[PDB]
Every structure is written in structure tokens, then in C-alpha cells.
């Protein structure tokens, strides 16, 4: 059964820390790979393995290491995090099927390495209620959710109606927006819409919640600021349907 699995999906860490990115497959594939892709570039091979005891550098300059002691596992280690390690890390395995090396990828780790942890901020979340000018004209009601002030760009926004996640009538910006573009470490904003029928909205028993999962600092992380520690957390805002 199964496939290929990578964790964590998201990581923000201080500089100089050791990092291990995990990769496993249950397909019994001999060949396994690590690819990296910075903001501006294509995927590029950093390490590969022909099987147990085989570990090869695909990029000579890379200061990551791998090991292969089990067919199943191909972990990647960064002994000393530098900002330049901030990247997307994709693990893959392959096999020969019909004389073709066919690759299967994990879903990646988004790694953010920061010189200064004080630039980490969780999102603030607001829900804006449908315009009555929208409702009376269109018979439909759009809720807007704004998540603001977060850094890095490591968030997942979801909509929950009456306690259950919804996908119908939802659109979330594919990319966030820089609140202060003139800073390459600018905080970020993201919006999403949830559109329901006006009568669904006008029902007071209906409960709407915009939820943003932020991935930030972990428990053990050092912190000294006069402001709550920006740990991994959920931030939400909610709204009730209202007649009117």
C-alpha cells in the first residue's frame, strides 16, 4: 500500500540550529532523491541514493547530508541552519516501469531559516459580514476573511460552517500580499471569500468561522520580547447569520 511521506510540511527556525527533514516511502523503491528549489529557480537535485549504503551528492556545494540505512527512509540533515537554507525541499523515490525511471514526490517541506526570530508574527484574523447591498441585489452573501501581519508565509486558511469545513463557494488568494513591500522580510496579508445564499446567511442559527493555522516557533524556542511568543497556533474570527 501507500506512497511517499515528508514531514514537517512547514518549518521556521533560528540560525545555527540542526535540522532533520524526514522522508519515507513504503513502495520498496531502491532509488530516492532530494530536490531543492529556491524562490527564483527550478527543482535541482541535491542528494540521491541508489539504495541502502548509497548516498550521492547531486550538488557539490550543498552543506546538507543524507543517510540510507533502510530502503524506506531517506532523511536529510542540515547541521547548521543559515538563512540561505530557506527553501522548498522535495523528496522523491523511483522505479523502472516499462524501461522508464518513474518518480513519485512527497509534498515538500517549506523551510524558513531566520537570523532574527523577532520577525516572526502570527496572523490577526477578521471576518467581514456580507454587504446588505449585495444581499438585496443578488440574493447571495459573500463573507470576507482577512488574515494579516503574519511572517513567514506558513499558513492554512479554512472556512467552517456549523462546525464543518466547507469548500463549496470558497476562494482563497493563491499567493499572499506584502504589507510593506520595501522590506524583503515584510509581513503578509491573505484574503478568502465564502459565498452563501442570502437566506442561509439571514438564518441566525448558522455559524461561520474563518480559521487560520499558523506554523511558527515551537515550545522549546528561546524568546525575550515584550509580546506573546509567536508559536504554532490557530487564529480564528467568527460571525453569526443575521436576518436584517
Amino acid at each position: 500500500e501507500a506512497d511517499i511521506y515528508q514531514t514537517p510540511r512547514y518549518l521556521v527556525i533560528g540560525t545555527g540550529k540542526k535540522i532533520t527533514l524526514e522522508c519515507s516511502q513504503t513502495m520498496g523503491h531502491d532509488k530516492m532523491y532530494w530536490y531543492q528549489q529556491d524562490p527564483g529557480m527550478e527543482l535541482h537535485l541535491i542528494h540521491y541514493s541508489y539504495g541502502v549504503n548509497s548516498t550521492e551528492k547531486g550538488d557539490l556545494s550543498s552543506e546538507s547530508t543524507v543517510s540510507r540505512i533502510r530502503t524506506e527512509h531517506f532523511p536529510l540533515t542540515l547541521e547548521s541552519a543559515r538563512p540561505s537554507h530557506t527553501s522548498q525541499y522535495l523528496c522523491a523515490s523511483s522505479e523502472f516501469r516499462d524501461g522508464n525511471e518513474k518518480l513519485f514526490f512527497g509534498s515538500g517541506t517549506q523551510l524558513s531559516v531566520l537570523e532574527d526570530l523577532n520577525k516572526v508574527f502570527p496572523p490577526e484574523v477578521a471576518v467581514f459580514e456580507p454587504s446588505e447591498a449585495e444581499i438585496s441585489h443578488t440574493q447571495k452573501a459573500t463573507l470576507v476573511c482577512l488574515a494579516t501581519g503574519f511572517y513567514p508565509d506558513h499558513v492554512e486558511l479554512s472556512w467552517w460552517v456549523n462546525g464543518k469545513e466547507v469548500h463549496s463557494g470558497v476562494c482563497t488568494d493563491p499567493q499572499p500580499l506584502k504589507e510593506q513591500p520595501a522590506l524583503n522580510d515584510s509581513r503578509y496579508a491573505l484574503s478568502s471569500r465564502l459565498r452563501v445564499s442570502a437566506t442561509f446567511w439571514q438564518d441566525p442559527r448558522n455559524h461561520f468561522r474563518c480559521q487560520v493555522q499558523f506554523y511558527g516557533l515551537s515550545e522549546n524556542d528561546e524568546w525575550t520580547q515584550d509580546r506573546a511568543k509567536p508559536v504554532t497556533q490557530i487564529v480564528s474570527a467568527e460571525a453569526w447569520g443575521r436576518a436584517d
Binding site: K31, E42, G58, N100, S131, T138, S168, T172, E179
Partner: protein, 191 residues
């Protein structure tokens, strides 16, 4: 080995045909296409091995150039679900085993047709008590271009399409906001 993909971005309406291209200065023993969805690993679509070969998989038609230095992906009757990053990867068997050289991809977005466009800019109030508000530009047709802010204190998102499935209804929207104070929804989306 140096793999060039074009165009970088392609935005198109559903129903349309399209071709995307992958070029290299180096000969490949084989060439793959992958599709990557955001937040997820690329997914293998096809492998071509023979110069001149045409592989058709449903609405996607892949061709391998005769000299094995280039390939194209042609999509017939594009559907919103075709949206994604199309990555081209070539093998140099002269290099090593498992050495695939990747292009940066074509980001393809396929937009739904809007049946009854009814553009409007609406003001929404914050759910909790705030002086804060947003502007919603919604129900515009697909050749409408939402202009970017450019002005420091105003934020404008790109267009997003949502599907109200039960209703057989889709709409475009874009959101604008400011801290305050000179900002009015009336000025927000002006062209």
C-alpha cells in the same frame, strides 16, 4: 541540462486549446512532464523516449521533438481542473542514473466562463466592532482586469473564482482594503 519552458505564465478561458513548450540545448534520452498543484509534490504525466513521438493521454497531447532536444504539451478544450504548474524534465543518459534536469515550469490558470456578469463594488463591515472595512469587487466577467494598487497604503488582491456548486453558479472577486483614512471603496478599483 539547461531546460527552458514557455510561456512562464498562461491565463486562459475554459474551452480553449493551448500549447506549452520545453526546450534544451542538450539531447535527452527521455523526457517527462509533471503537474504540480500548490502545496503538493509534482505528479508524473508522461514519459517520451522516441524522437518525433506523439503521446496522447485524454485531452493532453505530448510530442517529443525529432532531435530529442524539445517537447510540447497541447491541451484541448481546457477545463478549470487543468490549472497548475506544468514541469518538463529531461534525462541525459550520458550523465548519471536518475538525473532529471527540470525546467521552471508553465503556470497555467484556466478560468471559468461567467454566464451573467453583474459587476459591483460592495463595502463590508467587520463582524466585531471596528472602524475597519473591506471592499469587494465581484461578479465581473473574465476579460476584466483587476488593477493592482501601486499606492502604498492600499492593498488589492488578484482575482479569485468561487464555485457555488448547488446553484450551478460561479463568480469572480477581488478584495481591497486600507488602514484608513483617505481610502474610499469608490476610489479603490478605479481604472
Amino acid at each position: 541540462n539547461q531546460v527552458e519552458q514557455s510561456p512562464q505564465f498562461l491565463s486562459i478561458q475554459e474551452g480553449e486549446n493551448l500549447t506549452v513548450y520545453c526546450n534544451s540545448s542538450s539531447v535527452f534520452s527521455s523526457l517527462q512532464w509533471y503537474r504540480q498543484e500548490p502545496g503538493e509534490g509534482p505528479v508524473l504525466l508522461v514519459t517520451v523516449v522516441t524522437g518525433g513521438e506523439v503521446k496522447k493521454l485524454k485531452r493532453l497531447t505530448f510530442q517529443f521533438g525529432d532531435a530529442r532536444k524539445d517537447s510540447s504539451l497541447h491541451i484541448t478544450a481546457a477545463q478549470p481542473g487543468d490549472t497548475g504548474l506544468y514541469l518538463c524534465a529531461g534525462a541525459d543518459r550520458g550523465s548519471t542514473l536518475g538525473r532529471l534536469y527540470f525546467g521552471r515550469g508553465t503556470q497555467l490558470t484556466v478560468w471559468p466562463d461567467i454566464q451573467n456578469p453583474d459587476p459591483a463594488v460592495y463595502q463590508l463591515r467587520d463582524s466585531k466592532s471596528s472602524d475597519k472595512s473591506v471592499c469587494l469587487f465581484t461578479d465581473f466577467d473574465s476579460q476584466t482586469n483587476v488593477s493592482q494598487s501601486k499606492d502604498s497604503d492600499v492593498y488589492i488582491t488578484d482575482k479569485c473564482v468561487l464555485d457555488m456548486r448547488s446553484m450551478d453558479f460561479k463568480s469572480n472577486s477581488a478584495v481591497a482594503w486600507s488602514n484608513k483614512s483617505d481610502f474610499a471603496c469608490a476610489n479603490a478599483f478605479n481604472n
